[PDB]
Amino acid sequence: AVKKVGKIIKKRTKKFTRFQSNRFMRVKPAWRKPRGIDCRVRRRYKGTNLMPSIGYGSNKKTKFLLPNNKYKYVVKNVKEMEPLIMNHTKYCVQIAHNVSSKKRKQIIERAKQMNVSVINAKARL
Amino acid sequence: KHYNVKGKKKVLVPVNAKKTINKKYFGRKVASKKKYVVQRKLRKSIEVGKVAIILTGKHMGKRCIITKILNSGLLAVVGPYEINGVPLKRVDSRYLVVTSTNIFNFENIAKLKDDFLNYAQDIDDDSFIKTLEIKKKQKKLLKFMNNVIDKIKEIRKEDPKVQKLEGIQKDIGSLLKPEILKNKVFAHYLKSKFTLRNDMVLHKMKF
Amino acid sequence: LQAVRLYEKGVILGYKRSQRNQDPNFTLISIKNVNTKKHAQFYVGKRVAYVYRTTKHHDGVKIKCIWGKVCRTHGNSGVIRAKFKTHIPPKAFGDRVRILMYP
Amino acid sequence: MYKKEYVIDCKGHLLGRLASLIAKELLNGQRIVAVRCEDINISGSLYRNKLKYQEFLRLRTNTNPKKGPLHLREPSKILWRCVRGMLPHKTYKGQLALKKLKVCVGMPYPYDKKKKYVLPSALRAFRLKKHRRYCRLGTLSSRVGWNYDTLVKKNEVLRKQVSKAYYKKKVNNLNEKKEIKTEALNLINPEQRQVLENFGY
Amino acid sequence: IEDMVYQLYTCGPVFKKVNNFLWAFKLKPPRKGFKAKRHAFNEPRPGDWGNREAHINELINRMI
Amino acid sequence: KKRLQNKNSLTNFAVRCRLNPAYKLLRSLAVLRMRKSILEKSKNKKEKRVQKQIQKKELQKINHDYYKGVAKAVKKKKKREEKKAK
RNA sequence: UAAAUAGUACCUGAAAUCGUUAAGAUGGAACGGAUUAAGAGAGAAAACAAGUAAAGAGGGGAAUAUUCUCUUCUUUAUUAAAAGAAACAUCAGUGAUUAAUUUAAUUUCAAUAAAGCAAUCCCCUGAAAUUGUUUUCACUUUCUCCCCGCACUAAUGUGGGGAAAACUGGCUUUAUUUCUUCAAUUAUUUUUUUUGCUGAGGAAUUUUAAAAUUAUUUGAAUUUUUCUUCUUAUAAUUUAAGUUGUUUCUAUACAGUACUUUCUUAACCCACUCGUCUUGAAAC
RNA sequence: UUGGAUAAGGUGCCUAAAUAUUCGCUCAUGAGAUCCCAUAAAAGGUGUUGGUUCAUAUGAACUAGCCCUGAAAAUGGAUGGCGCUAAAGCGGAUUACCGAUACCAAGCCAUAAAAAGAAGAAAAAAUUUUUUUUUAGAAUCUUUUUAUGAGUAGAAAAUCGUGGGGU
RNA sequence: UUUUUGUUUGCUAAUGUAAAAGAGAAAUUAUAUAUGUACCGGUACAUAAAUAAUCCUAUCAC
């Protein structure tokens, strides 16, 4: 069903799974459109693995923003934080996975004094 | 102040505008563009001297007497504390079922209706509201259960705004005490509680 | 004696339904003493509480309620459709609901 | 529908109509107990219904009749099977609805001492024109192989005697209570009297 | 809009233009349902298609 | 322009008068005509109905003649059948 | 040895497959879709509290190694506010419901109280003597009477045969429609009870203009006026110009029994192995 | 997606909605029960119902509704099942209701088309002064509007990833 | 068998509801009639014939 928090409405949860991936190990759950001929899912038989459509698209006014109602931006050092100084209340910052504890403390403190929220603030400590 | 489009006389009441939304291009602005709103308007069967049944509070099923329409939709009610134990309570109409019997239809109660009104014109919604500093002080002691319950009771007692409501409650109850009590069956009616026996049907019985 | 009632008893039937198809947005509710559409119309707009017990405490209490509203009648025999904030679980079919005198 | 359980007297009730009403009640989560199931009536001649049951009896799985349709002969079991056929018994909810039903022949120990209800929408006197043939489920079961009809009749006449004694005692108690009321009604205050007789009490 | 109503109710000199300017009406199903879309209105049995004459108004009112 | 709510052009009085500049006058006239008392019609119903005696006479005669024609046709077809039977 | 779960098959060490422990399910498949519910895991980045004063640790910048200023963290008490959700109310849009209503048209009727007419007779209706016209009898109620069966009936009555007026029914006059009726259908108008769902947008030179309403004001018109209409000006409102307000709770918390989320189980409804050739595949 | 209202078809239970209302017919010791559709005929009946035409309330002859005979197959068996006869059958009639991914109103995604476009302060909270949000201008772009959306074989566009190379 | 407190190394305190909110109700029977009583199936008399459209049970604290 639809999920609605604040103004952000997510039109569908529980991401689509590939047909028959439940009962075949070689078939990964990642969605693939089934070509088939008599394919059930392709023909849209009721009660079987509905396919993604453009109609599920979230509205463009609130498309990419996180539950904190702002867009995420992934940074790798303190230098890539400069553009956030202007839109600190529209963007949250996430530190890249391959950033060391050297630099993570620096990015955390810089974002703190920049007044921009950090997503994975308590990582690697 | 009012407007009567199509002969209606909807009656307008000033309304504040406090919701603030960021406007499209540059600034922010107050969302509401209106200064007046048409007022509550109540059921035809809501009179001052009428007896209703509290329906949702901790006094569910209790009988009470309408006291005043508080010009905010909500109405003040007193199930006179001296006979019923129901204090001066501000409740709204849709959580009440009003019966068809006026307390002032009795010949010995009708005399003191003027004094009832002259005791009741001085209650208002701000008196019923809970003031911020006593709310803070009540929440302070939340950081053994009987002690905190008694503390909450006593701070509510020493609230200055509660005191005037209690005074009005006391004087109106003393005014209505003997005259109500000398009608035995009605006194028991007020003292009783309204249940819903399985013999009676809601859509058939009348209020 | 104690524990006044001041509500009407109802029973949760299935969802709003056709043969071979369900619309679990409306729940069919039967009233204790209503058997006609005219009588069922009397309760339209009233709040209905589905009160049920849980195995363990959730807010210091073992009981929780799902709220809903009597939207309109259903059929000719005094069954109503009710819309709840969250869909009634089909565990509850045949269970008891309070249909309260308020509003 | 809203009671803890409904005890219904199946005497003089048409089988299919009774089963339909019972099945709807069970599906709505109402526990019912059907008593005197051997006095259920069926439209159509006794011979015709016997022929129908013989056709049912001729029906078994060729490979292994143990698995076949268990035929059953007690009228209570026949009513139970009719209700089951009128019910989605292969689902969990349908199974619960089926198990919420109890069927008896005669009136046993708990149910002979509680009020028995009747479904007027399934009474033979109201649903069958008087000039058309009907059958008695007890006699049909006896012809099919139940061989417990007469014993149920004996138990029924015994229950009739004890019920008659209870009824006479109850009638005496009600008469004496009414006599108490008509006199104690003069001792209450006159305005209470007026209210009582105004509303017919 | 009153001129449009006049030109439509009476087949006035400006009727083709008003009708063409007017988007085709998108009506909801009848409030009490149809009789039988399969059969004629003039058939003795219940039916719906054909010329209803003045009886189209009651149908429009519940289709509107 | 940005799309707003399409106001009901029949019940929303402001939009109805905006669409139909004559509507408020027509409605006011209808309300005035409605606001007439009952004594006038009570004392004039007999006056309005007694003048309809000639209308009732005229409408009676047409239906009378139609029934006469129907009966005459019935009689003539019955006579034809009686003549043919022999 | 830094490391042996790097021990010679020795980097990493996936899947199939198997073991241990824990949790759950288990009536001739299992898995699944859609919707929730119950549990169990995790979680604070919106899912309350900016600032303020004090004291402790720090970091910077500017000012000519000494002053000012900016801050981060910790503790104290010290105040806001905001956000969501519920309830109620208002408005608007879209429906369901129950009471109506103006004016007309259509053979409507039906009563009230005083007269009168006809008596198988009347409003009717029926059957008979290049179209109309006219004539005849035959049409009703009786808790009325007479004769026969004289109790015979379904009957507290009855069958057959005759008389009677005239309550009943019909018609004609006069007054009334609140004793009673004034219907129904259609056209043409005006409202009303109780209620479901929804609230897009956020307008720096059109959320203006007007339209409506209110309060004054100008003249006119007319259905003749406590919603009469049309303008003359002014000032406000919204019924214009897509939802706003109040109160509570979350909560005076920093992660729980609540809230978000994953997973596992149920339950109602639904769901046949895919790929392929084929007109046609779940295909024996 | 949210509401509303329907189509086809249904409303005894399975199964949401009528054991609805109103008028007839039918008793079947193999009743009957929705187009396609899941078989039935000639010939009969002193079963019952209604009509037509002849003969002094009888005798006949026709006629056509339902019912019956005609009517026999192999695992056990199918109006879909239960069952149903004051129908839950057959033929009507009158209402109400249930019922779609169709229709209507509203929101949102995308597609297509369109209207248009290369600079200035708004609010709130504290107390005149501070504080907090924004204060926009990317032409395959921005704002707004309307309509529309199945799809094998096939075609195209925009996207998402991988090894390696310049920047 | 009764009372109080609770069930907020794999374990060694401990909880589940298909349905509480007055979940109230024992004569039998016939359906072109029944039931009670009194006499000897019969007679006589009562009763019942919208039967649950009923009756009974709740609030008067201390």
PDB file of C-alpha atoms in Angstrom, chain F residues 29 31 81:
ATOM      1  CA  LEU F  29     -38.339  37.141  -7.829  1.00  0.00           C
ATOM      2  CA  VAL F  31     -38.443  33.931  -3.463  1.00  0.00           C
ATOM      3  CA  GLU F  81     -68.469 -11.657 -36.822  1.00  0.00           C
TER       4      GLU F  81
END
